[PDB]
């Protein structure tokens, strides 16, 4: 088990299987070794992934549950559901501390910044909002959107945003002035899920795509977008060009994201698979039937070796990595 | 039936002449201008 | 952005079209307050410049006079006249014949 | 001024129509060439900036490709006019003041879109700090003709007016003052390596 | 004078120039005379001809003389001499621009280039999708100095669709003489081709609005601004129609005095060996994507040809108006074979006939109307493929719920139904809460 080279296999751990709906997304504790997922039974259920054995229910929203987030402590859980409303949970007592509307429609996202201060989120009004964490007050409103929002990442440092959209988009926007940074419009159908890239992946994209060292060292974030025309395109945010696009899902791209070492791409699709890809040579290595029916969203654990897949099959799967 | 000759038209050759008149053709050429520019074209005179 | 000033000054200092070589005269007709007047300190003063916020100075060309009409000086502070070439017309100068 | 001295003699009313077409003759030349010298001047100081940088190509790729396009319809109006490189022909050329407005106006926003370039340039050689986005334009593109540098030392020294260069323009030889005064370098610098 | 001009040292000759029209009046008599009349009828002018001139004809036994054109030279030359077996690049399969020479093609090439040099308009009639758009395009390729402008007529069109044309693409400009319209652009030729000119609805008194306005443009070169009630002269505009057979339905037969000034010219559909030829030729410049298939070109055009005779016998406008079947449906056959070869890099022939039977599916079985005639196709495309393509998996090949899709998969591949099923209950799960 290189400790930067595991990649999932496939022999699954645990079948996770308690939720009544479609599991919907699927996050890592940062730092307990615990895991979360929600599903659209207004539930969001808690297991531990080491030994397989559900922990408890959170309840309280009244519609399907489509997004949860963890802060940098873990101590609090940001969920957002198809009722209109973002609930903080906190996560020492598992009461939900502060309820959150104002959204005019369908929430499908929410993530909480990098400083865990305030908490964004997007809605199939077509807005982003942000929230302050502490007074649970919406303090900024990102439009430009012309379609439902599907998802909102923050970067790393938390100055800028990435949304997708079924306007055929993906927009960055700069928190601080609440500008459009960067439109990125490649794809040829709706974008599902984005992701950015962490820092120990930059040089090897430098790398990857031949992309000639900048004078001043930082290669410029980097950001990733499935979509449904069964494609992942990987974006330069500063020039606004697509540095690649990966091929080879049967299906609408659910979830993407990099291995945590930044050497590979870890995706889902609806095409019930899990594709691990290197993107050094633009190819995928290994697939994965993770599922019997649609893959919706992975997670990939910062340290320990291990993968979690939630589907519409209202199971949730645990995959070591070797 | 001018319904069906719009679409005759349309359907045939993908662009009505005579539906942008006057200021309608100046402002569709203006949005042309940066749909041209926006998707990575140079296009200045009316015709291309 | 330039203003009218600075765009004239810096069209007259650029000398495209061959002003340096002409008698360029800049007359400031109208009333002179301390909030206009006073970012000309530099330029009547030995300095003979002209600074921008942007870090920009532009030299004032030996062939550039800097002229103000002006009816009264109730306004104007010490630093402004002490910097300038005083010419008093008084009314008898201009008789009604 | 000569043929407005004429319309102002009793015996010009037999030269009305030949006195006004050379009037419109001469109105539409200093209207085409007025925009033409900022066009040549821009594009000089615009061809050096995107040729002489070979990080602009990564760092700013979309205006890049529009100076290139912007290129060579330039050097193409240029060829046609060193074909026919009379004046009345260019001034016959047909749409030479639309083309000519068009490059302008697409010049002006190419040099608007060049202000991270220039500003983080300007770390580079620090006295740059002191000098306009206009003239460090002119400064860095025009960088191989160093004959037109020597208005630009001024803002740059607190008394270096103008530099000492030889024949070649190529190794500077030393520095002058605008009183004259120069100082001759110990080991002359040269621009070539 | 462009002989004459090409060689400056030695101009036309006396002796030569007679041959040379001689043996193009014998070739214009027999191109006007019967250029809107059948093949069979051309043959019979042109046995009419060699029975009472004097003018030196092709010696050919069997060949008619309008198959042979007048070179330069003076002498009479086959028109297959131009006529090369050549290979299509595989990623121009069928595509719009693409023109398979042929006989006739070039026959109508240089009849419609003969004319169209002298901005004499001129009317392309024959059957819907035998040629007539390709070949009038194939001409204004060979002329560099036209545009062509498209405008399709309909039952309801009247003279303003080309009063808006014409201000689209045109301007009125003062002169002294009058009012002029001319092309916007200069020194270059405004060629207005309607496609319909025949369906304009006809009145209870026997006439065509469009038509007359046409006439009227055509003869006196202009037409009345009815704005200001003033003349206006055309300069630099040409026209070009095209039409199905007057005794088609919902065809009117045009007027005489219209006819006098528009030459019409007869575009019959492809014979079999022309459409052999044609899609052999698109055939094996497709099948190049796979090798191993690349020994089933001649069956598979042959097959398909057969098919679409069948179809275009079986199913007539007497039975249904749609049902009107040309090459543009083969056309289609192939752009849909190589769309559905293009991702694949290796299949065995059971496949390529299962792909055939789809697309044959999909453009002539959709359109039908009762069961039975479905029933039909479906009988007669396993007939056909089992004729020409023996030593198959029957059953492989044929399996009968053929489906394709790419829904499944990254591809355009044939996909089972159940599969099939599933998949879209979830998609329609989703599109329920979206949509
Ligand atoms: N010799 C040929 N080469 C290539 N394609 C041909 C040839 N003959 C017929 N076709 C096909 O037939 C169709 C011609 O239809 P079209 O010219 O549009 O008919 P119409 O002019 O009556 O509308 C085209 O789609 C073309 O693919």
């Not at chain 5, 094996?284 to 057969?306: D, F, G, H, N």
Request: glycine fraction near 6%; include cysteine.
């Amino acid at each position: 088990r290189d400790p930067k080279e595991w990649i999932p296999r496939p022999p699954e751990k645990y079948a996770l299987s308690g939720h009544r709906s479609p599991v919907t997304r699927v996050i890592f504790h940062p730092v307990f070794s615990v895991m979360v997922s929600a599903s659209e039974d207004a539930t969001i259920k808690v297991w531990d992934y080491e030994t397989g054995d559900f922990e408890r229910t959170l309840k309280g929203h009244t519609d399907s549950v489509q997004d949860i987030s963890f802060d940098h402590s873990g101590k609090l859980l940001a969920s957002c559901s198809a009722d209109m409303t973002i609930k903080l949970w906190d996560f020492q007592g598992f009461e939900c501390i502060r309820t959150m509307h104002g959204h005019d429609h369908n929430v499908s996202s929410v993530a909480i910044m990098p400083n865990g201060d305030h908490i964004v989120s997007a809605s199939r009004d077509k807005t982003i909002k942000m929230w302050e964490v502490q007074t649970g007050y919406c303090v900024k409103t990102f439009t430009g959107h012309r379609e439902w929002v599907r998802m909102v990442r923050p970067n790393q440092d938390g100055t800028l945003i990435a949304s997708c959209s079924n306007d055929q988009t993906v927009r960055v926007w700069v928190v601080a002035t609440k500008e459009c940074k960067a439109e990125l419009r490649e794809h040829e159908h709706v974008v599902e899920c984005i992701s950015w890239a962490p820092e120990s992946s930059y040089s090897s994209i430098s790398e990857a795509t031949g992309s000639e060292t900048k004078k001043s060292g930082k290669p410029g974030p980097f950001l990733l977008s499935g979509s449904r025309d069964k494609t992942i395109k990987m974006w330069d945010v500063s020039t606004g060009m697509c540095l690649m696009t990966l091929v080879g899902h049967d299906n609408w791209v659910r979830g993407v994201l990099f291995h945590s070492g930044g050497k590979f791409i870890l995706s889902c699709a609806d095409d019930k698979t899990l594709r691990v890809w290197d993107y050094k040579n633009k190819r995928c290595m290994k697939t994965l039937n993770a599922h019997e029916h649609f893959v919706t969203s992975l997670d990939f654990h910062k340290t320990a070796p291990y993968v979690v897949t939630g589907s519409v099959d209202q199971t949730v799967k645990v995959w070591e990595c070797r | 039936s001018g319904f069906l000759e719009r679409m005759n038209t349309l359907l045939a050759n993908g662009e009505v002449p005579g539906l942008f008149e006057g200021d309608e053709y100046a402002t569709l050429m203006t949005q042309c201008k940066e749909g041209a520019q926006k998707e990575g074209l140079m296009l200045d005179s009316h015709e291309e | 952005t330039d203003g009218l000033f600075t765009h004239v000054l810096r069209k007259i200092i650029d000398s495209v079209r061959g002003e340096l070589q002409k008698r360029q005269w800049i007359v400031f007709d109208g009333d002179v307050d301390p909030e206009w007047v006073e970012n000309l300190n530099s330029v009547l003063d030995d300095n003979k410049l002209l600074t921008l916020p942007n870090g920009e100075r532009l030299s004032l060309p030996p062939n550039v006079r800097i002229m103000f009409e002006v009816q009264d000086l109730k306004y104007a502070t010490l630093a402004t006249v002490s910097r300038c070439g005083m010419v008093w017309f008084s009314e008898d100068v201009l008789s009604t014949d | 001024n000569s043929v407005s001295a004429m319309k102002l003699s009793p015996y010009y009313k037999v030269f009305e129509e030949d006195a006004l077409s050379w009037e419109d003759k001469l109105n539409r030349i200093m209207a085409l060439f007025d925009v033409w010298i900022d066009v040549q001047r821009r594009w000089v100081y615009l061809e050096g900036i995107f040729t002489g940088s070979a990080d602009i190509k990564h760092l700013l790729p979309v205006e890049t490709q529009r100076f290139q396009s912007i290129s060579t319809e330039f050097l193409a109006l240029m060829k046609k006019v060193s074909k026919s490189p009379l004046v009345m022909d260019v001034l016959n050329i047909q749409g030479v003041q639309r083309s000519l407005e068009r490059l302008a106006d697409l010049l002006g926003k190419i040099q608007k879109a060049l202000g991270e370039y220039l500003e983080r340039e300007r770390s580079s050689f620090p006295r740059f700090y002191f000098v306009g986005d206009e003239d460090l334009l002119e400064i860095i593109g025009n960088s191989k003709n160093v004959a037109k540098l020597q208005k630009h030392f001024k803002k740059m020294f607190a008394g270096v007016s103008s530099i000492i260069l030889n024949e070649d323009n190529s190794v500077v030889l030393g520095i002058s003052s605008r009183e004259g005064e120069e100082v001759m370098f110990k080991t002359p610098v040269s621009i070539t390596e | 004078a462009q002989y004459n001009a090409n060689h400056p040292d030695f101009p036309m000759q006396i002796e030569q120039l007679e041959r040379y029209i001689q043996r193009y009046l014998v070739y214009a008599i027999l191109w006007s005379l019967s250029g809107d009349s059948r093949l069979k009828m051309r043959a019979e002018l042109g046995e009419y001809i060699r029975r009472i001139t004097t003018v030196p004809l092709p010696t050919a036994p069997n060949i008619p003389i309008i198959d042979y054109e007048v070179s330069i030279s003076g002498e009479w030359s086959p028109w297959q001499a131009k006529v090369p077996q050549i290979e299509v690049e595989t990623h121009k399969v069928a595509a719009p621009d693409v023109v398979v020479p042929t006989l006739d093609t070039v026959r109508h090439e240089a009849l419609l280039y003969t004319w169209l040099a002298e901005h004499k308009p001129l009317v392309l009639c024959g059957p819907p999708g035998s040629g007539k758009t390709m070949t009038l395009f194939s001409a204004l390729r060979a002329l560099p100095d036209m545009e062509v402008v498209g405008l399709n007529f309909s039952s309801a069109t009247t003279p303003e669709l080309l009063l808006k044309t014409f201000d689209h693409y045109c301007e009125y400009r003062r002169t002294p003489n009058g009012v002029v319209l001319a092309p916007v652009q200069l020194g270059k030729w405004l060629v207005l081709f309607c496609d319909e000119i025949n369906l304009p609805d006809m009145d209870k008194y026997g006439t065509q609005r469009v038509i007359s306005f046409i006439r009227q443009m055509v003869e006196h070169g202009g037409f009345y601004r009815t704005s200001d009630q003033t003349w206006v002269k055309l300069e630099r505009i040409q026209f070009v129609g095209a039409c199905n057979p007057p005794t088609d339905p919902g065809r009117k037969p045009l007027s005489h005095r219209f006819l006098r000034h528009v030459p019409v010219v007869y575009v019959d559909y492809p014979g079999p060996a022309s459409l052999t030829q044609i899609y052999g030729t698109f055939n094996r410049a497709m099948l190049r994507l796979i090798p191993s298939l690349r020994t089933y070109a001649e069956p598979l055009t042959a097959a398909m040809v057969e098919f679409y005779t069948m179809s275009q016998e079986r199913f007539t406008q007497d039975t249904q108006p749609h049902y009107i079947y040309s090459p543009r449906e083969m056309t289609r056959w192939v752009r849909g074979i190589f769309e559905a070869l293009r991702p694949l890099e290796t299949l065995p022939v059971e496949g390529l006939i299962r792909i055939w039977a789809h697309e044959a599916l999909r453009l002539f079985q959709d359109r039908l109307v009762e069961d039975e005639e479905r029933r039909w196709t479906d009988e007669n495309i396993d007939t056909v493929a089992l004729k020409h393509f023996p030593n198959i998996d029957r059953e492989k090949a044929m399996s009968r719920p053929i489906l394709y899709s790419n829904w499944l998969s990254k591809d355009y591949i044939p996909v089972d139904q159940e599969e099939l099923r599933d998949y879209v209950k979830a998609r329609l799960k989703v599109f329920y809460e979206e949509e």
